[PDB]
Every structure is written in C-alpha cells, then in structure tokens.
C-alpha cells in the first residue's frame, strides 16, 4: 500500500517504492490453515 | 539544508523539493543591528 510516505514522492516526484519506510528508517537513523492437498 | 525527508528523495529518486517538510506536513495530515547607511 502508499502511505505516509510513498505518497509525497508519488505525488510531486512521479515514482514510489515499495519497500519505502525501510528505505527511510535505514537511511535517517530513525494462521495457517488445514487444506487435503496430495503430494 | 536537505535533511530526512529530502534525503531520501535525493537519494532514491534522484529529485528534491525546498519546502518539503511543509508539503509533507499538508499532503499527510499529521537577528537586528543598526549601520550607518543614506535613506
């Protein structure tokens, strides 16, 4: 999803990245179901 | 200055905006002397 901050670069830049807040906090300092399948 | 928000821009993107911090801020909810001079 775009939010917070993928969304000021989406749109005034033109691009957004998706894996953006870790980019940011890296760059600052900052239940499984049962199905009957066959194998 | 550029710091942590157009850095990441700059950065990843390759672009930067001055007043980013207000654009963010809004997009997102959220020294006198005396000379001697001639008037």
Known sequence: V???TNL??????GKAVSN???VA???LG???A???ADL
């Open 30 to 32: 900052g239940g499984s």
């Open 8 to 13: 000021v670069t989406a749109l005034v830049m």
């Open 20 to 22: 953006m807040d870790d």
């Open 2 to 4: 775009i939010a917070n």
């Open 25 to 27: 906090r890296y760059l």
């Open 34 to 36: 049962r199905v009957r």
